Structure formats: structure tokens, C-alpha cells
Design a binder for these strands. Structure first.
Lengths: 107, 314, 93, 82, 98, 93, 107, 98, 82
DNA sequence: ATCGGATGTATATATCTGACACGTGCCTGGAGACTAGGGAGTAATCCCCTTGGCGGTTAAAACGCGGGGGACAGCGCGTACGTGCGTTTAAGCGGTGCTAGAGCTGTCTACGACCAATTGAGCGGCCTCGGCACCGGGATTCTCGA
DNA sequence: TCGAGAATCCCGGTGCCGAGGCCGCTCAATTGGTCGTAGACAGCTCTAGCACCGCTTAAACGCACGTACGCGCTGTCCCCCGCGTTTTAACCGCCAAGGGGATTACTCCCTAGTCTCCAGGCACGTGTCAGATATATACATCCGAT
């Protein structure tokens, strides 16, 4: 009767028990494997780390401590693979990255 | 960068050991041995009346061999100008080649027959074998070391045999990208080491190294040291050969009357000497010890001088 | 009514990535919605794959295939490496 | 307490600022009301689906989740609200 | 001697400013009344959560930004710098909105 | 291996609407896959909607709402009409 | 006690029981309603009737009896609502409805 | 006196013919070898069902037809009748393929 | 039995007939090989996903269902094969 | 190309907050422990479909060959649109006010789950014939120099 | 601008294999019950949405006006269409080996399901400081006189 959360067993910061319960009661399959929630929480944690890295980078670049939606937009737009992941997704208070076309410049 | 108007009716061009004499088998069946230094005639030998399809110089630059369209293979000398040998055999010849290390064996490639190595001393000759048994258009060439013969069939299969025993020392059917087969146009060599080339009918010159070829032996999968072609025009080259130093390789685009020189190691295109658009390029060769390129277009000889930076700035 | 979310976990991974910085409530909601969306994408792909193989047990291999399908290139590579490491650490308990 | 004819709630300077955000330099007048139609058209999709969800929910108002799902089923998913 | 910038310069400056900014470029109450008037087509006395209404408005605003983006693209492709209704119709046609 | 399909039912419906009209096996397979795709889309939308209402029983109301969502306009109107008529016919017995 | 299929009771041609089995095995819910498969069979029958009627009309216009994929694609593209339903769909052997732009015509 | 149609007329006739026709406009074996060569990027000795290969080829063919459609649309919008690589790039940009 | 460099399997007249089907009247040469790239690019998506499905199926060849699912997950679903 | 000037924009400082970090008590969902069953893994076999190759045909790709026509660049223009200045309008805040409907809880019932017993609808497999693919030819119809 | 000439429409005839009707032979659909529970309904709550007031003011409407960019026309010129020849390799038909695809039969290790327990997560306060707003300043930038 030694208590220990499954997230610690995987050494992650996402709730493996919660995602396992959700995959169970979410009607995706008759049965759910044991390591599948661990793997899914792992990939979710990796994706969150990847996006939050660029988010905090842009926030520090703008001298802002708390990350704002604009920083999320800049992060997901500057990255190539991340933008390809969210190619048809919009963000609240996201706006558009600064982008001026070539000919539009004065001459 | 030059021409030879005194030479007319040209069909072939070959270089001697020092490359100082160009043998021109003329349309009227004569052989003009033209000297490079004096830019004039060194000898003229009226061999026959049939156009010479191919010539080949001796290792010592003394003997020469003519192959007229009369199905006649003959051997002559540069100085005497007398017919040392003359014989007739059917299936007119496309390529004759002296043994690079021997002055008796000469390779002769007939149309409807397998290549035959004929002895200059006596009446002995060895018929080279055939893999697919139905070539009917086959090329062959002696190796640079005078120890092997590469034979290319009409279906990409290549047999490397020993120049003396004609035993199977290597064999490989080359791909064509699309994994089909292709009739081998020419198999030529360089003067240095063993790096050689194969010009095919699917417009891909393959720069191979004969060391790995002999190493693979049976059912080998040899890949060329370099791939050469014209990506923008897709020109089947009538004749391809190395430069004088061998580090560069020249190919003769006959359809558009030009010469294309690439490298060997990296194989990047050195440059393109595009001749006059009018005529039709037939033959091409490079001076073995000089940066000179002797081409032959529509029956007349043209010269290309790759002159170095001097002669105008010193 | 305890309407759950992923807020605390996003906060934790943020602190572990950048301790000095913080995050607003709206940005946390965006992160929660994005997590839910990508997780539902992966779940749907896994269910479709399981049906295609007529298997009724979604396992780690299904998630591997789903993430290799969804995430592009190097994202997928790093994600599957992290997932394999995590599942190996967990199974070695 | 009935609304009508408020399509002009979107104004010419509002559309112009929106186009400026879109990086547009010069705009013709015939665009503005034209754009309005487009905008309205857009709503007639999502708005519809929105109430439809509430129609199934047996409720009488619209939640954020409703419009999020409506935009999702239209390939225009939106984050920040669930 | 009153000073006046050349045309487009003020437009480019406003473009930079708005690309830098993030707030909504549409007045709240007019858009809300418009949403109510349009929803009248499906059922009366339909209420709306304020947050839901601004979410809808901002999603549609971002869709409008995107649409103006491709209209600008087709315009600069047509060797022009002024968008025209034919360009908007072309963009919506390519996107598959008709 | 017994492979379930819809060919006979498509043939029956065709004979109903078009007595003396033929159909190719290729077109029959296209129609079968089209039925399968429409059924998949409708079932997925209905399941998502039911889950959004925290329900667990997909019923006639769910399918009606999903049809109103997926089909545009008069197609959806005649579809809901036919569905209500069939529901009435079945429930009457 | 004799047995009659539900489609007969519903006056339908599509297999109601097969749709019920598909819904059960599809993991769309913990339990499918009674009238849900009937309704689904009904809407599927209506859609098939519409598309097949249009296809047969096109085939009769082409002086042929066997409905070929070309007729199906032409019928699909010859309806606004059906096109919007299948705009993101590619039909085998379909090609494109005969269409030439304005300026491409000589003068 | 040899006869020659004006340019485009034969092109328009072929357009009508191919719009009427339905068979594949790409040779089978070259496309199949291309698919094998491209799949070599993921695993060797990968076999393919013939029907699967022609299904892939025809789906990609229809995608190419669609792409040429919007390129034609942007071209006629640009007051031109000759498609250009910039037009294809614009079409793929609007479709969201880059 | 190894394949390579067969991108020219698609030919200029083939692309031209395809464009004719697309209603194109006049085509520039710089299109052709350009188009090739596009085509190749397209495959690198679906082809990839294709083998991925087989990768999960623990098989060694590709079925029609595989490429159908690959096109489906890319919003380009195809009928006629399941 | 240059310099003075106006305008707009980035900055520092003040300072003022309200959203935000976190500390807490409590709940319930997640971890532990245990039991059943059976979907998935293994192996062995059968076989269909794949890959491979060869030979003859020609439809088709490649190449080239004139030549006319759309792409494009320049030029002119005038109309429509940015821009700045006004005047005028509802937009935004917040403030209170009413309550209709979300939103939660508690039933109790009717409604599938599920299990078993039963069997004809449906499906692999088998002939079989005619709508249709192909074709030969002849009339028909679009186009291009007069 | 009317014939000449080339591509298409169509009519009739030939022959074939796929479409279709039919046949055993399952097994998945149907029917009858019993169980446990999903949610329909009733009822109570409160809060968030709805509506009006008023107040200030940023923002919108309209005008005047310069002006510059869409548009239209000329002229050139490349370049791609068009059509002939020449090449090839796609295709198709056939034959071969086997290799993984698919199936079936065992077998069990894994997971659903159940009960117990407690502990991390979550609603809810609580200071508190990161950033939002104003102001004055200092600099970067466009633009006209030169």
C-alpha cells in the first residue's frame, strides 16, 4: 500500500491517470492499453514544452514576464512545423505577425 | 578556337602516343596524318576508296589501322605508307583498338558479330563471348593496363574478361534509372590509373573505376564514380572521352554540334564549347598531353585551343 | 462544480522551462484549449487506426503511429523519442 | 426589444482598419458593403450551426463551446475557450 | 504651409501599428446587435453569453484578416496595389466558398 | 471471407427510382464507399454532439440534429422529413 | 413467432439491423437509441435516392443504361447542395464537368 | 498548300475532347515506377496492390486537374491566358500548401 | 532491382494533356518540371502516411485502404475503393 | 541628393491597480489490490497477388521547325481614393434593475444491454446474355484563305 | 465574305465480359425475456444576460483636394503553338516463383471491473507586483525647398 502517482513513475508533469480516465470514458476504443496514456501524456508534455519555450522567448523579447496571447501567436507563427500543426487554427487575441509584402514598400 | 581547312572529307580522328599527329580517315578512303606542331601535313596515305569508319594509333606512335566501309581492316605504317596488312570480314566494323601494352593484338567490333581480338603477327584471333547471346550490337575496349577487356552488350550487361584468357573476371548489368536496359554506345578509358567511362544510349555517361569493377567480379553492383549528362537538353552523345590529363571528360553532342567538358572527382561541368550550329558534329578527341580538342563536324576538322592565361598578358 | 482543466500542469511545465516568466489567465485558457484539441486529434486518429486494424485495444503503438501521422517531421521525431523514453521508464518500475 | 437592419454596424473605417491589419494599402469603395455581405454570409454558416447545437441542448442561449464547435466542424477551429 | 504626407505612407504606418497591436478592430455593441439580428433568422428571444459573442466576433475578424490577406496576394499578383471586389470573389472562389 | 457491403440495397433503390437503368460495379463500389463515408461523418458528428451534452445515448434527436448540421438547406430539410416519416412508421408498430 | 426485419416495419430498403450493428461496433456511444438506426437508414436512403436519380438522369441524357462513374461525377457537380456536401471529395473516373472560361473563347 | 489551324483552336478542341473523356492522362508504368522510387524514401522492398497504385495515381491526377483549374482562374484574373509558375505558386499559397 | 531518378516518368506531353483536362490553353515551359516538384511534394505527404499505416499494420505492402485513409486524413478523401 | 522642419513613435518615470501567485480545506478521482476472459500474439499452412521478365505494336514521347500572337514594357490619362479637417454620432462604462433561463439535485421510470434460442436475408460462387466497347464508313460540321 | 479541307456525329454491325439473375449456406438479424441505469421530468436556485440612463468622447460621415495608380493603347518580340518526322518504351499479353497476406487454431498476459482508501486537484480567499496608463522627452522618419 505504497502510494505513488503514475505521473511520477513516468517522470512527467501531466496527469497520466486523468488522461487514462478520459480515454476510457471518451469512447475511442473498447479497451485502452496501459502504456498508451503514459505515451500520450508524454507527447502532450513535449508539445506543451515546445510551444511554451518559444512563447517565453517572445515574452522575454518583449520584456513581458507573463506570456500574453500575442506571444502565443508569434510563437506558433514563427515556427514552421508548429504552424503546419495549427495551419487552420486561430487564437484568441492572436492577431497576425508583422508581415508587409515587398512591393507594398514605398519607392 | 580553330579549324583545319586543308583537311577535307574527314571522318575520324585519333591521337598518337604524344598526340602530335592526328590521323584523319577521309571520305575518299585516304588517311591524312596531320602534324600538330607545324600545323601541316605530316603524311598522306591513299589507303582505299571507302570511307574510314575508325582508326587507332600505336603505343609507340608508329603503326596505324584503318577500317574501311568495304568490310576491310588494314594496317599501315606512318612513314612507309605501305599496306602492311589487309583483310576482309563481313559485319562492318564500328571500333578498332590496339592493345595498349602489346603491338600484336587488336580489338575489332563487328556489327552482327561479337568483338574479335586479332593478332598482328600471325593468323590467330579470339572471339569474345556474349552474355545475352542476342546482342547484334556490341562494343568492347581494352583496359588501360592492357590486362582486361570490357565488353558491353545491347542490354546494359557488361562482361570484364582477361585480355589473354577471356575468362569471366567481372560481370554486371547496369541500371538505367528506370531499372531498364540500354544498348551500350561506347566504353572508353583514360591514360591515368584505371578510371574509365561508359557512354550509353539513355544519355548517361557513367564514370567508373575499374578497380572496384574487377573487385566485384560476379553479380556485382558497381556504381559509377560520377554521372554525366545534359539535364537541360538531354543530348545523346556520339562520342565521349577523357581530357588530356584525365581529370576532365569531354562529350560530343552531335544533335546540337557541341562539346561538353565536365570534371571527374566532383564531375561538375567545366564548360561547353558550342561550335557552329550549322554543321553536324561526328567525332571528338582531346590531345593527350596538350590542352587541345580536335573535333570533326559534318566531315571537316575543327580545332579548340584551351590556351592558358599567357601569350597575351606576359 | 469542479470543472477540471490542465492549468496546473501547464504552469508546472512553464516553470520547469522558464521559472522567471509567468502566464495570464487568457493565455492559460488558450493553452488548455490547444492541449484538448491536439489530444482529441490524437485520440481520433488512434481510434480510426484501431478500427482499420479491427483491434479494440488502443496501445502505445497506436499512439506512436498517430503522432507520426499528425506532427510534422522533427516535431514527430522528438515526440516519439520522448514518448518511448517515458514509457520505458514507466515499464521499468 | 427587436433588432433589425443593423448590418451597417460594421462601418467603412472599421473595414478599412481591418484591411490595414491585412496589409492592404489601397481599397475601392465597392469593396466595403461587398465585404459586409461576405461577413454576413460567413455568419449564416457558423451562427446557424451554433443555434443548432443549442437546439440539441434544449437550452435558450449560446455558450462559447457552441461557437467553438461550430467553427471546428467548418475547418476553422478556434482556441482560447475550450 | 500645411504639411501632408504622400498617399500610402500614413496607410503603411497604420498597417505597422495594427500588425503590432492586438485589440479588436470592430466596435463591440454594433457587432453584438448584428449577431442578434442575424440569429433572429433561426429563433427569437435567443440570449448570448458575452464571452461567446466576443469569441465569435474575434474568430470572424481573424477570418476577415485571412481573407484580406489572400485578396492582397492576388492583387499584388495582378500587378496592382488596390484590392477590388473581383479579387475578393476570386479569393473566395479559390478557398471554396461558393 | 464474407465482406459486408451495401450493393444489393443500392441496386434496390436504383431499380425503385430508375427501373430500366443499369449500374457498373465500379460505380456501385463508389456509391458503397459514399454511403460508408456519409454514415461515418453523421455518426461522428452525432457522437461528438452527444458527448458535448454529457449524454451517453445516441438517439433519433441526435441523428436529426447531426443531419441538420451536415446537410445544407433543402437537402437537410427533405432528409429530416424522411427520417421523421420513417421514425413514425416504425414507432407506429 | 415469425420474424420480420425492422426495415420492413419501417418501410425502408436499407438494412436497419446492419446499421444498428455498425453503430454498436463503432464506439460512438455506450448504447445507441432504438430509433437512431432507423432514422440513419432513412436519411441514407434519401441521399442515395437523390444521387442515383441525378445519375440516372445524366445517363439517360448520355443515351446509356449502365451508370458509369462519369455520370455520378456529373450529377454530383450538377447540384449546389450536393456539391457543397461533396466539395472535398474526389470521385473515381470522374474528370470534370465540361467547363470553359469566357476569355478562352476566340473571336 | 499545307493547312494549319490558328493557335489555340486545336488546343480548345483537345480541351473539349479531354473534358468529355475519362481515362487516365498519365502512363501507367512510369507513374508506378515513380511511386516505387518515392516510397523508397521510407522502406525498401515495399510492394503495392495494382489497384491501390492506380487509385493513388488517379486521386493525384484529379488533384492536378483541380490545381490547374485555380491556376487558370488566377491567370484569367491577371488578364492573361498563359499560366506561369508564379500563378501555380500563388494558387498553392492560397490553398495553404506552403 | 532498385529504382531511382524516375521523376521524369511524368512527361511534358502528359502534363500538357493533364492541363488540357484542366482547361489550360497556353503553358510556359518553366511550368513542366515545376509541376513535377509539386506532384512529388504531394506524394511525400500521402505516400508517407500510407506506409505509416502499413507500419502499424506490421505488413510489408500497401493496400488500397491505406492510401484511401491517407488521403482522408489530408482532407482529400477518395471514393471507389472503400 | 541634402537639410530643416513636423509628425509620429520609442522611453523613463509615476503610480495604480486588478489580475495573478499561492495558501488552504475539502472532495473524489486516482492509486492499490484482486479476479475474470479473451484480444492479441504465435505458429503453421494455403494461396493469391506481386514482382519479375520477354517480344511485338504503336501510340506516344522527343525533337525540331516555322510564325503568329499574347506578355510585357512604356506611355498617357483621369478618375477614384488616400489624407487632413472639420462636424456629428453612437460607442463604451457602469449602474442599477428583473428575472428567464442555465444550472444543479433528486427521483423513478422506460429504455437499451445483453444473453440465448431461431433462421431467412445476404453473400460467395456460377452460369449467361446483351449493353456496351470497338469499328468501318459515311454524312456532318468548324475553320481558314478568298 | 464560300468552298476546301480536316475533325466530329452518328448509323450500323461484331463480338465480350461484366451485370445480373440464381443457389446453396451460413451467421447475423430477430424475438423474447430480465436488469440495471440514462435521463425526463419536477423543482428549486441565482446569475448572468438582458434592458434602459446617462455621461463623456473617441470615433465615424462627409468634404475638399491633390495625385497616383488602374486602365487603356502601341509596339515589340520572344516563345510557345502547330505539325511534320523520328524515336521508345508503354503496354499488353503471356508465363513463373514465391512471399508476404490472410486465415485458423491455440494460449495466455494483458486489461476491464470492483472495492478501499487517501491525496493531489480544485474552489476560494489574499496579499501584491507586472503591467496598463499618462506625461514629458528625445530620437527616427517623411517631405518639401534647394
Amino acid at each position: 500500500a505504497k502510494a505513488k502517482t503514475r505521473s511520477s513513475r513516468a517522470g512527467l508533469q501531466f496527469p497520466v491517470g486523468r488522461v487514462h480516465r478520459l480515454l476510457r470514458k471518451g469512447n475511442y476504443a473498447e479497451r485502452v492499453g496501459a502504456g498508451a496514456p503514459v505515451y500520450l501524456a508524454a507527447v502532450l508534455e513535449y508539445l506543451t514544452a515546445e510551444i511554451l519555450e518559444l512563447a517565453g522567448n517572445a515574452a522575454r523579447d518583449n520584456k513581458k514576464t507573463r506570456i500574453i496571447p500575442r506571444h502565443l501567436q508569434l510563437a506558433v507563427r514563427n515556427d514552421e512545423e508548429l504552424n503546419k500543426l495549427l495551419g487552420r487554427v486561430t487564437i484568441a487575441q492572436g492577431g497576425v505577425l508583422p508581415n508587409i509584402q515587398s512591393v507594398l514598400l514605398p519607392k | 578556337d580553330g579549324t583545319l581547312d586543308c583537311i577535307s572529307m574527314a571522318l575520324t580522328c585519333t591521337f598518337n602516343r604524344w598526340g602530335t599527329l592526328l590521323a584523319v580517315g577521309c571520305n575518299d578512303g585516304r588517311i591524312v596524318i596531320w602534324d600538330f606542331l607545324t600545323r601541316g601535313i605530316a603524311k598522306i596515305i591513299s589507303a582505299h576508296i571507302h570511307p574510314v569508319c575508325s582508326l587507332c594509333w600505336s603505343r609507340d606512335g608508329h603503326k596505324l589501322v584503318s577500317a574501311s566501309t568495304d568490310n576491310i581492316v588494314s594496317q599501315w605504317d606512318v612513314l612507309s605508307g605501305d599496306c602492311d596488312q589487309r583483310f576482309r570480314f563481313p559485319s562492318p566494323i564500328l571500333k578498332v583498338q590496339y592493345h595498349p601494352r602489346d603491338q600484336n593484338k587488336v580489338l575489332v567490333c563487328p556489327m552482327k558479330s561479337a568483338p574479335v581480338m586479332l593478332t598482328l603477327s600471325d593468323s590467330k584471333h579470339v572471339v569474345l563471348p556474349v552474355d545475352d547471346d542476342s546482342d547484334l550490337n556490341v562494343v568492347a575496349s581494352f583496359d588501360r593496363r592492357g590486362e582486361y577487356i570490357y565488353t558491353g552488350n545491347a542490354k546494359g550487361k557488361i562482361l570484364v574478361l582477361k585480355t589473354d584468357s577471356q575468362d569471366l573476371v567481372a560481370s554486371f548489368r547496369v541500371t538505367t534509372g528506370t531499372s531498364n536496359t540500354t544498348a551500350i554506345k561506347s566504353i572508353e578509358f583514360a591514360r591515368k590509373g584505371s578510371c574509365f567511362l561508359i557512354n550509353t544510349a539513355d544519355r548517361i555517361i557513367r564514370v567508373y573505376d575499374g578497380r572496384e569493377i574487377l573487385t566485384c567480379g560476379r553479380d556485382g553492383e558497381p556504381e559509377p564514380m560520377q554521372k554525366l549528362q545534359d539535364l537541360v537538353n538531354r543530348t545523346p552523345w556520339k562520342k565521349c572521352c577523357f581530357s588530356g590529363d584525365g581529370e576532365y571528360i569531354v562529350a560530343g553532342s552531335a544533335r546540337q554540334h557541341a562539346l561538353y567538358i565536365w570534371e571527374k572527382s566532383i564531375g561538375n561541368l567545366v564548360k561547353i564549347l558550342h561550335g557552329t550550329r550549322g554543321e553536324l558534329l561526328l567525332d571528338v578527341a582531346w590531345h593527350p598531353v596538350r590542352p587541345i580538342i580536335a573535333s570533326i563536324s559534318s566531315g571537316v576538322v575543327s580545332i579548340w585551343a584551351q590556351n592558358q592565361v599567357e601569350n597575351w598578358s606576359a | 462544480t469542479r470543472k477540471e482543466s490542465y492549468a496546473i500542469y501547464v504552469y508546472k511545465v512553464l516553470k520547469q522551462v522558464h521559472p522567471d516568466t509567468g502566464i495570464s489567465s487568457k493565455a492559460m485558457s488558450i493553452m488548455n484549449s490547444f492541449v484538448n484539441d491536439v489530444f482529441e486529434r490524437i485520440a481520433g486518429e488512434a481510434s480510426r487506426l484501431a478500427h482499420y486494424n479491427k483491434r479494440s485495444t488502443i496501445t502505445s503503438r497506436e499512439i506512436q503511429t498517430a503522432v507520426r501521422l499528425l506532427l510534422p517531421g522533427e516535431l514527430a521525431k522528438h515526440a516519439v523519442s520522448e514518448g518511448t523514453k517515458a514509457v520505458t521508464k514507466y515499464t521499468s518500475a | 426589444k427587436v433588432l433589425r437592419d443593423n448590418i451597417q454596424g460594421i462601418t467603412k473605417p472599421a473595414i478599412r482598419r481591418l484591411a490595414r491589419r491585412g496589409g492592404v494599402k489601397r481599397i475601392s469603395g465597392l469593396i466595403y458593403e461587398e465585404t459586409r455581405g461576405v461577413l454576413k454570409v460567413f455568419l449564416e454558416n457558423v451562427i446557424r450551426d451554433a443555434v443548432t447545437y443549442t437546439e440539441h441542448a434544449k437550452r435558450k442561449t449560446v455558450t462559447a463551446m457552441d461557437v467553438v464547435y461550430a467553427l471546428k466542424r467548418q475547418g476553422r477551429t478556434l482556441y482560447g475557450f475550450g | 504651409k500645411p504639411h501632408r504626407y504622400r498617399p500610402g505612407t500614413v496607410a503603411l504606418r497604420e498597417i505597422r501599428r495594427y500588425q503590432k497591436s492586438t485589440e479588436l478592430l470592430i466596435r463591440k455593441l454594433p457587432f453584438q446587435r448584428l449577431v442578434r439580428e442575424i440569429a433572429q433568422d433561426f429563433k427569437t428571444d435567443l440570449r448570448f453569453q458575452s464571452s461567446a459573442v466576443m469569441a465569435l466576433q474575434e474568430a470572424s475578424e481573424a477570418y476577415l484578416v485571412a481573407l484580406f490577406e489572400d485578396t492582397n496576394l492576388c492583387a499584388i499578383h495582378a500587378k496592382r496595389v488596390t484590392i477590388m471586389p473581383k479579387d475578393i470573389q476570386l479569393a473566395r472562389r479559390i478557398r471554396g466558398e461558393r
